[PDB]
Design a protein around this ligand. Sequence first.
Ligand SMILES: Nc1ccn([C@@H]2O[C@H](COP(=O)(O)OP(=O)(O)OP(=O)(O)O)[C@@H](O)[C@H]2O)c(=O)n1
Ligand SMILES: Nc1ccn([C@@H]2O[C@H](COP(=O)(O)OP(=O)(O)OP(=O)(O)O)[C@@H](O)[C@H]2O)c(=O)n1
Ligand SMILES: [Cl-]
Ligand SMILES: [Cl-]
Ligand SMILES: [Cl-]
Ligand SMILES: [Mn+2]
Ligand SMILES: [Mn+2]
Ligand SMILES: [Mn+2]
Ligand SMILES: [Mn+2]
Ligand SMILES: [Mn+2]
Ligand SMILES: [Mn+2]
Ligand code: NA
Ligand code: NA
Length: 326
Amino acid sequence: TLNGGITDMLTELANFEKNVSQAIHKYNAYRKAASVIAKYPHKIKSGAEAKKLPGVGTKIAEKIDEFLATGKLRKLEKIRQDDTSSSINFLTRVSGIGPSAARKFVDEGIKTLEDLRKNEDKLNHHQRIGLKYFGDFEKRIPREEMLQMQDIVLNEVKKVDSEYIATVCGSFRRGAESSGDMDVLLTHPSFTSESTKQPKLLHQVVEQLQKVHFITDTLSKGETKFMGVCQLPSKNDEKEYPHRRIDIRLIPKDQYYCGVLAFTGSDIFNKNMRAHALEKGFTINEYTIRPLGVTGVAGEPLPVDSEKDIFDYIQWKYREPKDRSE
DNA sequence: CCGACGCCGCATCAGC
DNA sequence: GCTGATGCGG
DNA sequence: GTCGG
Ligand SMILES: Nc1ccn([C@@H]2O[C@H](COP(=O)(O)OP(=O)(O)OP(=O)(O)O)[C@@H](O)[C@H]2O)c(=O)n1
Ligand SMILES: Nc1ccn([C@@H]2O[C@H](COP(=O)(O)OP(=O)(O)OP(=O)(O)O)[C@@H](O)[C@H]2O)c(=O)n1
Ligand SMILES: [Cl-]
Ligand SMILES: [Cl-]
Ligand SMILES: [Cl-]
Ligand SMILES: [Mn+2]
Ligand SMILES: [Mn+2]
Ligand SMILES: [Mn+2]
Ligand SMILES: [Mn+2]
Ligand SMILES: [Mn+2]
Ligand SMILES: [Mn+2]
Ligand code: NA
Ligand code: NA
């Protein structure tokens, strides 16, 4: 983090553009700039120097020059002082409360943690659980705890059916020493691109994890995606572990490689990789990589037998999970 | 300048 | 109830 | 906000 100060500034800027301005493309531009700057191996000495990076344009170049000179950015100092922006930014920190709901709540005079608690009845289920575990969800997860959580998920899954394969992805697969949450990829041979030979495949698994009191709440749940809350068991007299966010994603077993690539990320890595794919004439999702027709219409799925095979198609050298944290 | 900017699951809403 | 749009977050 | 074209 040679440029930690600059990247923090951009990140705050992006957050403003998303939560207050509701400008998703500006949100993404800042995040892209923050990401590129973040892997740049020199302490940036000037805006001109940063503007050599792809993603960093004239405005960000100017903002960087101001930051390096003063240590601050007037634009931000102002935003920080605007109550509406401050409140909207805060409220969006609760899971399930987005920029729209945040601006709505602040219109009603609901604008603090306390207002939220006193108005649970105005929250949907997701928002209610996000607020319940607000403080908890702020905390990160040491890798040691992720290893613990991994053993529990992987072993309980075999208790439901030994044909199941659960793979922890997200930041954990990228080798991060701590994760904001746990992301699990699930396959079962009875669920492929070609048929759904069994129902409840995800339910079965969610239930068992609840049965053993690992999963504690649910944010949302469908036939292939579960979003909820979990917690490690604590020892005698031991204070309890923080409640943690968990997402489980059941994908067609034949499409594992696109799946694991997709849920491994990072989110920005994906955005960069899929756009380059578009530049190279393919579309990549969590299921498939397909060619674009002269019209811009996805063709048929190409044969994939490894994550590397996906990289090949778009003419990128393979990058280990650890080198995908953009 | 201009159009594009990754791609998708689930929850909720409106409208029929 | 269904279908499409919008929110939200992955 | 940035970029290829
Ligand atoms: N959630 C998972 C994880 C693994 N696989 C299967 O397990 C094999 C590979 O085993 P593993 O080392 O655990 O996964 P990979 O990272 O894909 O290893 P490799 O690249 O050597 O196949 C893959 O062919 C895939 O079919 C699966 O079906 N579902
Ligand atoms: N906008 C997004 C967000 C998420 N992801 C995928 O979902 C995974 C998990 O999402 P998230 O948990 O939010 O990201 P992590 O990289 O795991 O970060 P953290 O350490 O905070 O959990 C990401 O790695 C990425 O593969 C994505 O495709 N696009
Ligand atoms: Cl935008
Ligand atoms: Cl600042
Ligand atoms: Cl597809
Ligand atoms: Mn997170
Ligand atoms: Mn994660
Ligand atoms: Mn996650
Ligand atoms: Mn708790
Ligand atoms: Mn582009
Ligand atoms: Mn240009
Ligand atoms: Na640039
Ligand atoms: Na939120």
